[PDB]
């Protein structure tokens, strides 16, 4: 049976790029019978990436067992609630990630390669180099895009020196001008006007279990926070519906200005006091400004984890 | 600040060797201010290893915070209950291990290098090579000893092809004949007659939390199982005391004949039905013979994990 390689639910560019690239690396370098798949359709930014390099989106699955798989390799995630529905029924052969670890356990030893760098694609690319496996233009393009996507063109505080070193290498392999391509790709993911309120709050959203509470943290990239706030009423309605249908304790939406590097936080839930403590602010009409925030893994999750536990 | 590098409670040769070696690697490759420390004194096997290569036992600590450390690097373990007492109060900067993952979580991203190989020392050695950092005779000796210890001289089912590949290389760097040295160090850890019953059951023992139950799994290396069983009365008394003192639901002792690769399982607790299901045998007078069993991580933990969750 093939070993399925995939990123998290609501995959982003890095999730798609890292799983596609690692599935290939695992075949060439480790002789594993892998297959890259996805848990969701590409969102707009990734659609731009796939079209630019001429790569088909990995097929979407809903059950690892239904595919006949016995083993899986996770990229860009490790928390079970962010993975395939029946993740508990298959063996986790390996994990390549750059996120915090939680709600993850195995009965047996496994392979894990985690680094606190800008993207999982960055880790995968460096693994290509260490194993002397040639990187095609298409794979370079997808990995480069994952890196650019997750670090907002190397300016996010999650950007590691090693990310800055490999970006130009990947751009060369991908046949693109790093800044020219990067800016175009990032802009492709800021067209929120084409999305309904219910769609926008689930484009890039993950669930975190904080002290027994299921907290949904969503993020959207924009070039104008004010414009998004003009739709506050409809967004709040969508959020309330999401909370009711999924049983979340709280919903935190990051409206991220990727040009100026700040996020307006729109939150609704039963633990707003914990949200305010985490962000050192006071919500007014369900929102407040979080200066300098662009990263969920570095500027939202650690803080919420701490506030919910104390 | 000082980053402490250490193995699990009741450290064995691999725990001591891998942490000693990794602390050096981290300092040499990145200039990190690391310090290898231990959570306990070396067992008799490791004492032989340390004296053989002229290395002092890493100093023992009881609290990471008491040492002024804000960050730690764990080797040979990841489960919090097997780590430093205040592991939840410090940041886990990195982990190098070859065990299953459980009871481990972080608020922030981190470094993790896990591989299902024979020892953590094996992983550390290959990391030295990946970083182009030369290995001294003493560090080679400690890492080789960790590998020999955890795989019983490369004959345990946990032995990986990569372990067999690096063994001769490490032996040459350590200046020893692999078989001659291996037999000598392994023998040094089989003197059980001189240990009290209370000492014996805690030489090499780890706690696993299975479905809310704290199960203690200890192991001792011997050349004569029957000889150890002559002391069953006092050993059981020590086990009952340990169960009472620590609130364990069950205690499993592996009496391992390292010459013939078999283990007698002596178990006492509230879930013997789950223990019998895990090993597919019947306990008589609290014990049963398990042919071919020598590995806790491969032949005990996965099986108990499954039976306790059934
Ligand atoms: Mn992602
Ligand atoms: Mn990512
Ligand atoms: Mn160990
Ligand atoms: Mn080990």
Curated annotation (Swiss-Prot), chains A, B:
It holds the Pfam family DHH. Binds 2 manganese ions per subunit. Mn(2+) 1 binds at residues 8, 12, 76. Keywords: Cytoplasm, Hydrolase, Manganese, Metal-binding. It catalyses: diphosphate + H2O = 2 phosphate + H(+). Its EC number is 3.6.1.1. Its cofactor is Mn(2+). SMART domains: DHHA2 (SM01131). GO terms for molecular function: inorganic diphosphate phosphatase activity; manganese ion binding. One of its GO terms (cellular component) is cytoplasm. It is an enzyme of class 3 (hydrolase). Mn(2+) 2 binds at residues 14, 76, 98, 150. Gene3D superfamilies: DHHA2 domain, inorganic pyrophosphatase (n-terminal core). It is found in: Cytoplasm. The keyword Cytoplasm applies. Coiled coil: none annotated. The keyword Hydrolase applies. Belongs to the PPase class C family. Homodimer. HAMAP family: PPase_C. This is Probable manganese-dependent inorganic pyrophosphatase. It comes from Streptococcus gordonii (strain Challis / ATCC 35105 / BCRC 15272 / CH1 / DL1 / V288). The lineage of its organism: Bacteria, Bacillati, Bacillota, Bacilli, Lactobacillales. The gene is ppaC.
């Amino acid at each position: 049976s093939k070993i399925l390689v995939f990123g998290h639910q609501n995959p982003d560019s890095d999730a798609i790029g890292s799983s596609y690239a690692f599935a290939y690396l695992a075949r060439e370098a480790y002789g594993l019978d892998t297959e890259a798949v996805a848990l969701g359709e590409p969102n707009e930014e990734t659609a731009f990436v796939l079209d630019y390099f001429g790569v088909a989106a990995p097929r979407v699955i809903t059950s690892a067992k239904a595919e006949g798989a016995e083993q899986v390799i996770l990229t860009d995630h490790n928390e079970f609630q962010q993975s395939v529905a029946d993740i508990a029924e298959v063996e986790v052969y390996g994990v390549v990630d750059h996120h915090r670890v939680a709600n993850f356990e195995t009965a047996n030893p496994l392979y894990m390669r985690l680094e606190p760098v800008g993207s999982a694609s960055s880790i995968v690319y460096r693994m290509f180099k260490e194993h002397s496996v040639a990187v095609s233009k298409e794979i370079a393009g997808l990995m480069l895009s994952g890196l650019i996507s997750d670090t907002l063109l190397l300016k996010s505080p999650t950007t590691h020196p090693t990310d800055k070193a490999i970006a130009p290498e990947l751009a060369e392999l991908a046949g693109v001008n790093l800044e020219e391509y990067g800016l175009a790709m990032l802009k492709a993911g800021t067209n929120l006007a084409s999305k309904s309120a219910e769609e926008l709050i689930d484009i890039d959203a993950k669930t975190f279990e904080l002290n027994g509470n299921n907290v949904r943290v969503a993020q959207v990239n924009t070039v104008d926070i004010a414009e998004v706030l003009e739709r506050q009423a409809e967004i709040e309605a969508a959020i309330e519906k999401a909370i009711a249908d999924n049983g979340y304790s709280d919903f935190v939406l990051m409206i991220t200005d990727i040009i100026n590097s700040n996020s307006e936080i729109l939150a609704i839930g039963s633990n707003m006091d914990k949200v305010e403590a985490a962000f050192n602010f006071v919500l007014e009409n369900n929102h407040a400004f979080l200066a300098g925030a662009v990263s969920r893994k570095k500027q939202v999750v650690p803080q919420l984890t701490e506030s919910f536990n104390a």
